[PDB]
Amino acid sequence: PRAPRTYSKTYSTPKRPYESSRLDAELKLAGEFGLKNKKEIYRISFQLSKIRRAARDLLTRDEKDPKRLFEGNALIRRLVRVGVLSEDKKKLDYVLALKVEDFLERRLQTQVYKLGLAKSVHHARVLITQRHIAVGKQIVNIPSFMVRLDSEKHIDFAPTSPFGGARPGRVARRNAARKAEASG
Amino acid sequence: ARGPKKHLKRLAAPHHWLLDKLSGCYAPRPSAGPHKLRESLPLIVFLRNRLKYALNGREVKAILMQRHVKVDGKVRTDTTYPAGFMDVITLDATNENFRLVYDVKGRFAVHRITDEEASYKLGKVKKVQLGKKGVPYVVTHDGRTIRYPDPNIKVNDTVKIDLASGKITDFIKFDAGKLVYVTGGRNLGRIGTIVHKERHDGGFDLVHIKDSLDNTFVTRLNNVFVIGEQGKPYISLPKGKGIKLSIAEERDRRRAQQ
RNA sequence: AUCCGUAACUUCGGGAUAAGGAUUGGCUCUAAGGGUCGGGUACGAUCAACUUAGAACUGGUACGGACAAGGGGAAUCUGACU
RNA sequence: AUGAAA
RNA sequence: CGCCCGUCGCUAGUACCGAUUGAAUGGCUUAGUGAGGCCUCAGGAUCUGCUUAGAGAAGGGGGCAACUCCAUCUCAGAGCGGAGAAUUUGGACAAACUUGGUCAUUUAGAGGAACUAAAAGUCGUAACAAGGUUUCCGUAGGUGAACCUGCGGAAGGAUCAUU
RNA sequence: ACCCACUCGGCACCUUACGAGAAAUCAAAGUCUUUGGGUUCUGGGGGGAGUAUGGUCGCAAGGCUGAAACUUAAAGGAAUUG
RNA sequence: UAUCUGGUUGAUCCUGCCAGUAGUCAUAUGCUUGUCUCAAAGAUUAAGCCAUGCAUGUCUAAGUAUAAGCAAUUUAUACAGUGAAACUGCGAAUGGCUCAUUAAAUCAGUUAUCGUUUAUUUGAUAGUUCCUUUACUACAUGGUAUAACUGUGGUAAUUCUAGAGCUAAUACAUGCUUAAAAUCUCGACCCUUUGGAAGAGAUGUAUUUAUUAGAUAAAAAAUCAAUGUCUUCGGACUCUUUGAUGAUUCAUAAUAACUUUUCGAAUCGCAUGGCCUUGUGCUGGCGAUGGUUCAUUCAAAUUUCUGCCCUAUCAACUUUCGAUGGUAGGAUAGUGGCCUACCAUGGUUUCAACGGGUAACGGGGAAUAAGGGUUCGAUUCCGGAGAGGGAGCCUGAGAAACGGCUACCACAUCCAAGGAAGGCAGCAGGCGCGCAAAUUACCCAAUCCUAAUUCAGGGAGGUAGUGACAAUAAAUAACGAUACAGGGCCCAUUCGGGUCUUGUAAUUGGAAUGAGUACAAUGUAAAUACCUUAACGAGGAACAAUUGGAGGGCAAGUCUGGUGCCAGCAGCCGCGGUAAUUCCAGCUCCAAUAGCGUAUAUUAAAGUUGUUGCAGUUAAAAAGCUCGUAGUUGAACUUUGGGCCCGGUUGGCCGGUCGGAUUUCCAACGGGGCCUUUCCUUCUGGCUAACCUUGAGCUUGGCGAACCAGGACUUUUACUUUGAAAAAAUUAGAGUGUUCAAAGCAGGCGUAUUGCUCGAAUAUAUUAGCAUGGAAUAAUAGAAUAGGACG
């Protein structure tokens, strides 16, 4: 009787499974951007495919089609707001062209690595999941973020964890107690 | 099912109350009254999901029972009474008077107004007849049944009422070139200044109607609601005045009012 | 006796009253079914028969009231039949 | 006239 | 020394025919019995209002002595009525049962005749070359088996050809 | 009756291959993925099976209609070299 | 994102199928499984049976309270506080569960009730109730129980009940009390006769019948049956009034009666207010309850058009004893074969009737896709049906009620054997069925509902538990330096450095928090969980990621041992008969990953269902041939043409705005109108319109649609355009930082004391139905021995 909660995925499996080209390309991407799951890769490709289908079946339409105008401008707006797209490419053909590599570089983990708080994208991953980070004034422990660039301006380490101070560390206190006992 | 209904689920409750599909799988059924089921606003959804003056139906029953509230100049101490179209409600607390009208987005608005704008209302005549003992009478769109009006007052006209009695302050007939208000369809909330009409004798009197941006449309003569004459409305009107701008125009509006 | 319904098989003719069921009195009525005589250069009068159908009322549910008056079905062997 | 199984 | 056909023989399976007036299940249903309520004809325990109803005789009021006025515990008796269950006639509604008929859905079965499958079974060698009687089609007959023969037809023939 | 030329309708023919087709081959077996002139009938892997049953026609022989279970990865068409 | 691959051959092209492949809110199962969030869940087989326990009861200020119940009135002598039980009134017909039934039936859209009921709410609404109407009768108000209770008690048992004594009412049965006029009758009386008359009964509401009115295209004349108004009795005669409806015998009003008699307050809580004719006189408020009629609202029942799966190994079906219609009547709340009496004999059918089957309730919708589509859809929302099968019925506004009665049928229980009580397809739970499916839990905190009512109740519902059904997020590990190997550049001083690389590592160190433990607070009805953070919690032996596979399609061993066409593997092909790249083990390696496989159904693939869009010479397939009905399809033609203008969109000068917007714009583009033999309905009207109407340059008077009511011819369709409307959820999609995300519809901003503030769009909605501009296309009758139009 309680109206059932909608659920819908955010990915789609490959049509044809075993294509060595596909597998090696997406492995390159996983091994450079520090990923664990072809699930994640398929997910991002599925989002890209959705927006690309929209792009196709929108540029099919004439100019000044108010549907085209509103939806394409909103699409531009969210793509510039997330930063996968630039601040000067709003012609919808760049949208036809955009890349999973663009999505991945706009993710948080490799962003962290570019900003230099990691020394390795995997170091960024473990820091994210161990909460040695916050993008605004609230901690986040998810790599897949799709930052909105205000976060980018506002990045810092976790205030409530070392590398932003406020505590020496669990094993830090452990080592300190160890040396206190040694001196004792 | 063997008798009258008593319950009401969500998702059979109408759209324009904006009741949420979560929060318990049952909804407030409007008990019978001077207005229909669907084009009616229960006081529970009013107080609990328009003002947030309360949070729960228990609180709302406390309010209705302590009688800060009154409709038609009467307390009306039921939690699910139909607050219909055009209707007046008066609150001693805050000394407010809310009016129940529509918005162009297809919703019951909340029109803050004064005590005299409450003390008069509007009512569409639903029909006219001759009661027993030769008493001509009429009946409105809010179940109000009134005796000895002007013979000039005929069907599809509108009346402005004292609200201390069911008597008339004045009336306005139906004819080409009069200001109206829409009730039914995609045009829920429009105000579109009758330009002409058409009969189709046998059913569905239709009316061609356009608002002051030249923008025209067509509506059913029982869904329209005449509010007086062109220019002056007999009441104060809500934000928009029944315009239905484009999605992009409204986007720009709010982006100007960021 | 009337009404209802009727298998397999068949030489298509039969089987078949198949099987199997219902009803049937008395009294008072009602309907239809005929013959002959009738018209200025649609119809009337008049006579007598049995049938069939139906309806009321009735009865110690009885009634082809005595007499009279088929038991049937599914299969085999055998000869075709009279 | 026939000519084993993979 | 290729491939290949059918009978016969063993093993396993699937379905079909089949005596058994076969068996079940369900539905529709003639006829018959027909509950149970409901409506209508009565019924009348029972209770109960009114109308009187005369007196066994108290009380007091009056001829104060018989006698007289009304109330009174009493009981018939009479009608004037109200409601009234059990029971009850007839009617329409009609569960269930019995019996047949009928419609579909599954199912047992002596035996019989088939089909299929299965590494190496027997008998032959019909077919593919002119396949050793050119093949096949229909029809009829014949025989262990493929199969043969007759009548007509075709080429998918072994001939596109006799001025 | 012949000859020439032409004509309409017929049995067919010689050559091409624009066109088509899987190929043989074909003046349609063409004007079909640049997919539509009109209509009818039939087929949907092979076998089981044109079997079983039920109707229906016939003296019969048999015909018309006509499945399923089950089994199987092939059978089959046209051409090439051997 | 309109995709293919392997397999018949010695090889080739093909048909043609198979298998592979991807997905499923499609199920089951296996092996495994650390975390956050959301959550389905005994439908499939049995609508099979069910123990046990709950699931609907209910009161205020205010219907009845002496509880011999409890506080205390002390403002109350009758109570007047509270208050079980009981009477009463409501409701128990909603919810919830399942999908057995049902194939023009439900249902979906779409119409009607001018053909009906409707408690409840909501708005209005009962001067008329003394019926020999004068004593026939209290209206500062009338009669009756009866419960509860007292007690006697009776059965083994029952929500079993009798017997006797009380008492109450908004329970029952009854019951008067307020106007004025106005017509009829009578009708005293005068009697008049032109004829005048006092006085008396009636009339409210409601039901039933009969009757009238309830309207109205146009103007005059002759009179009277008798002048009728008032009279000049020469006749002036006018005056007249009726709403809605598309349209009614409509609304509604009145005559005359009918009624076994309907309603017209004997009810209740508060507050006590005013006149004095100083009377418990007379008047007075805010309410609750109920109440006749009408309308309204939530409903309900019938109802118009359209539309449903497979079947002809079902072609005739229906009507005895209703099938089709009609008349009259009955019943119904209402029309009507709904039923009867009588009567005519019809009605449906290849445009597939009727019959059968359905692992059929239907729809909103789901998977899946370029389009077209195919399939599923019991299943959270809508409408239907049912309560073990059937039938019936009481109460009620509302049930054919089943958590209500009666019976029968099959089930099944307790018996102190006489009798008694039941129907989980409600929540839990159990048996059985199976491939296949949760706790005999907490709470009404919310969402809502119900009652007399804020206060109580609610397995409706929420909560938690089981839960790898499905979805979201995402740990299992990392980082510096130390032994090797590099790539640029510099020195080009050799092969020295290699500054720095980026890895290879029985290298080493740290910091680094999580899972789990939480003290706690927070969470929530109470919690248990999430988040928060103390304190405790790693170096891999730590805290240990599985599931499939390695010959191909199809990525991943020419590795080791074992086996020897055996055991076994393998979807398809195939491997294995002593060197197995397939088997069984070790090692390694690839795929996906807390999931992966397997079995079955279904979609894409599949142009292997082919309308789009299949094949038919030989691959399966053209009927032996012809005729022929229905069906589908069916030659060409009937208005073209040009002119004339008009004004809109698009650009196009000028940008006269510093890349916005304008003009004469040349031109195009489609649109409106006049004429070219082109009536392209007109009569009444008022607008008379556009007014020929003109007053001196802004005046007095043109031809009806351009507004409208009608009279009118309006021969038929299909088609096509536009609009109203199509319940939400869903779907697509706007905005939105649930810490991202799935989600949801919230949120955001303050001077953070007054507070401010956008939102919750929009789109889609098939056919069919209504209106709708058009008039090409397709047919479609038209006036021919003219019953022919204008007349």
Coordinates of C-alpha atoms (C1' of nucleotides) in Angstrom, one line a residue, chain G residues 314-485:
Chain G
rC314 C1' -17.8 -25.9 -33.7
rA315 C1' -22.3 -23.4 -39.1
rA316 C1' -26.2 -22.6 -38.2
rC317 C1' -28.0 -20.3 -33.3
rU318 C1' -32.3 -18.5 -30.2
rU319 C1' -38.0 -19.4 -29.0
rU320 C1' -40.9 -25.9 -25.4
rC321 C1' -41.5 -23.5 -20.0
rG322 C1' -39.2 -15.4 -23.2
rA323 C1' -36.3 -16.0 -27.6
rU324 C1' -37.6 -10.3 -31.0
rG325 C1' -41.3 -6.6 -30.7
rG326 C1' -46.0 -4.3 -29.3
rU327 C1' -50.6 -3.3 -25.9
rA328 C1' -52.5 -3.5 -20.7
rG329 C1' -51.1 -4.7 -15.9
rG330 C1' -47.8 -5.9 -11.9
rA331 C1' -43.1 -5.2 -9.4
rU332 C1' -39.1 -1.8 -8.7
rA333 C1' -36.6 3.5 -5.6
rG334 C1' -36.9 3.9 -10.7
rU335 C1' -37.1 2.8 -17.2
rG336 C1' -37.5 -1.8 -19.4
rG337 C1' -39.6 -9.2 -20.8
rC338 C1' -37.8 -7.4 -14.8
rC339 C1' -42.5 -10.7 -14.6
rU340 C1' -47.2 -12.0 -16.1
rA341 C1' -52.0 -12.0 -19.7
rC342 C1' -52.9 -11.5 -24.9
rC343 C1' -51.2 -10.8 -29.6
rA344 C1' -47.5 -10.5 -34.6
rU345 C1' -43.4 -14.2 -35.5
rG346 C1' -39.7 -12.8 -35.4
rG347 C1' -34.2 -11.7 -33.7
rU348 C1' -28.0 -12.9 -34.6
rU349 C1' -25.2 -15.0 -38.5
rU350 C1' -18.6 -15.9 -43.1
rC351 C1' -18.1 -8.1 -41.7
rA352 C1' -17.1 -15.9 -37.8
rA353 C1' -23.2 -15.7 -34.8
rC354 C1' -23.4 -19.9 -31.4
rG355 C1' -20.3 -23.6 -28.9
rG356 C1' -15.4 -25.0 -26.7
rG357 C1' -10.7 -23.7 -24.3
rU358 C1' -7.8 -20.1 -21.5
rA359 C1' -1.3 -21.9 -16.6
rA360 C1' -7.8 -15.0 -18.5
rC361 C1' -10.2 -10.6 -13.6
rG362 C1' -9.7 -6.0 -16.6
rG363 C1' -7.1 -1.3 -16.8
rG364 C1' -3.2 2.6 -15.2
rG365 C1' 1.4 0.1 -16.5
rA366 C1' 6.5 -3.4 -16.8
rA367 C1' 10.9 -5.6 -19.8
rU368 C1' 12.6 -4.6 -24.7
rA369 C1' 13.9 -2.0 -28.9
rA370 C1' 16.1 2.9 -34.6
rG371 C1' 11.1 3.0 -36.3
rG372 C1' 7.4 -0.7 -36.7
rG373 C1' 6.9 -4.0 -32.9
rU374 C1' 6.5 -8.7 -29.6
rU375 C1' 5.8 -10.3 -24.7
rC376 C1' 4.1 -9.8 -19.7
rG377 C1' 0.8 -7.3 -16.6
rA378 C1' -2.6 -12.1 -9.7
rU379 C1' 0.6 -8.5 -7.9
rU380 C1' 1.2 -1.1 -3.7
rC381 C1' -3.3 3.0 -7.8
rC382 C1' -8.6 2.7 -10.3
rG383 C1' -12.8 -0.4 -11.2
rG384 C1' -14.9 -5.5 -10.5
rA385 C1' -15.8 -10.5 -7.8
rG386 C1' -15.6 -13.4 -3.5
rA387 C1' -15.3 -15.0 2.2
rG388 C1' -15.5 -23.2 2.2
rG389 C1' -19.6 -24.0 -2.3
rG390 C1' -24.6 -22.6 -3.2
rA391 C1' -29.4 -20.5 -2.0
rG392 C1' -32.2 -17.0 1.2
rC393 C1' -33.0 -12.9 4.4
rC394 C1' -33.3 -9.5 8.8
rU395 C1' -31.5 -4.9 10.5
rG396 C1' -30.4 -0.8 8.3
rA397 C1' -29.6 5.4 4.3
rG398 C1' -26.3 1.9 2.5
rA399 C1' -25.1 -5.4 2.6
rA400 C1' -27.6 -10.1 -0.4
rA401 C1' -22.9 -8.4 4.9
rC402 C1' -20.4 -13.6 6.0
rG403 C1' -14.5 -11.2 11.8
rG404 C1' -24.5 -11.1 10.7
rC405 C1' -28.2 -14.6 10.9
rU406 C1' -31.3 -19.7 8.4
rA407 C1' -30.9 -24.2 5.9
rC408 C1' -28.3 -28.0 2.7
rC409 C1' -23.6 -29.8 1.0
rA410 C1' -18.3 -31.3 2.1
rC411 C1' -14.9 -30.0 6.6
rA412 C1' -13.9 -29.8 11.7
rU413 C1' -14.2 -29.2 17.4
rC414 C1' -16.1 -29.8 22.9
rC415 C1' -19.1 -33.3 25.6
rA416 C1' -20.3 -34.8 33.2
rA417 C1' -23.6 -38.3 25.3
rG418 C1' -28.6 -34.8 27.0
rG419 C1' -26.6 -31.0 23.8
rA420 C1' -23.5 -26.8 22.1
rA421 C1' -20.4 -23.7 19.0
rG422 C1' -17.4 -22.6 14.0
rG423 C1' -16.1 -20.9 9.2
rC424 C1' -7.5 -16.9 8.4
rA425 C1' -8.5 -15.7 0.2
rG426 C1' -7.3 -10.2 8.0
rC427 C1' -2.0 -10.1 11.3
rA428 C1' 1.3 -13.5 13.2
rG429 C1' 1.7 -18.7 13.1
rG430 C1' 1.2 -24.0 11.9
rC431 C1' 0.0 -28.6 8.6
rG432 C1' 0.0 -30.1 3.5
rC433 C1' 1.4 -28.5 -1.7
rG434 C1' 5.5 -28.1 -3.6
rC435 C1' 11.3 -25.9 -7.5
rA436 C1' 9.4 -21.7 -5.1
rA437 C1' 8.4 -17.8 -0.3
rA438 C1' 9.7 -14.2 6.7
rU439 C1' 8.4 -13.0 13.7
rU440 C1' 2.6 -17.0 17.0
rA441 C1' 7.2 -9.3 18.2
rC442 C1' 6.5 -3.4 19.8
rC443 C1' 3.5 0.9 19.0
rC444 C1' -0.8 4.0 17.8
rA445 C1' 4.7 8.3 18.0
rA446 C1' 3.3 9.7 13.2
rU447 C1' -0.5 9.0 7.8
rC448 C1' -5.5 8.5 8.4
rC449 C1' -10.3 6.4 9.9
rU450 C1' -14.2 5.8 13.4
rA451 C1' -17.6 7.0 17.7
rA452 C1' -21.7 10.9 21.4
rU453 C1' -16.2 12.6 20.7
rU454 C1' -9.8 17.0 21.0
rC455 C1' -9.2 12.8 25.5
rA456 C1' -10.8 6.1 23.5
rG457 C1' -10.0 2.2 19.9
rG458 C1' -7.7 0.6 15.3
rG459 C1' -2.3 -6.5 13.4
rA460 C1' -5.8 -0.2 8.6
rG461 C1' -1.0 1.6 9.4
rG462 C1' 4.2 2.7 11.4
rU463 C1' 8.1 0.3 13.9
rA464 C1' 11.8 -3.4 14.6
rG465 C1' 13.2 -9.0 13.4
rU466 C1' 14.3 -12.9 9.1
rG467 C1' 15.9 -11.2 4.4
rA468 C1' 22.2 -11.7 -1.1
rC469 C1' 14.4 -10.9 -4.6
rA470 C1' 15.8 -6.7 -6.8
rA471 C1' 18.6 -1.1 -6.7
rU472 C1' 22.6 3.1 -4.5
rA473 C1' 27.4 4.1 -2.4
rA474 C1' 31.9 1.5 -1.5
rA475 C1' 36.6 -1.2 2.4
rU476 C1' 39.8 -5.5 1.9
rA477 C1' 44.7 -1.6 1.1
rA478 C1' 48.2 2.3 0.7
rC479 C1' 53.0 6.2 1.5
rG480 C1' 58.6 7.7 2.3
rA481 C1' 63.5 6.1 2.0
rU482 C1' 67.2 1.3 0.8
rA483 C1' 69.6 -3.6 -3.6
rC484 C1' 68.5 -3.4 -9.4
rA485 C1' 66.7 -1.5 -14.9

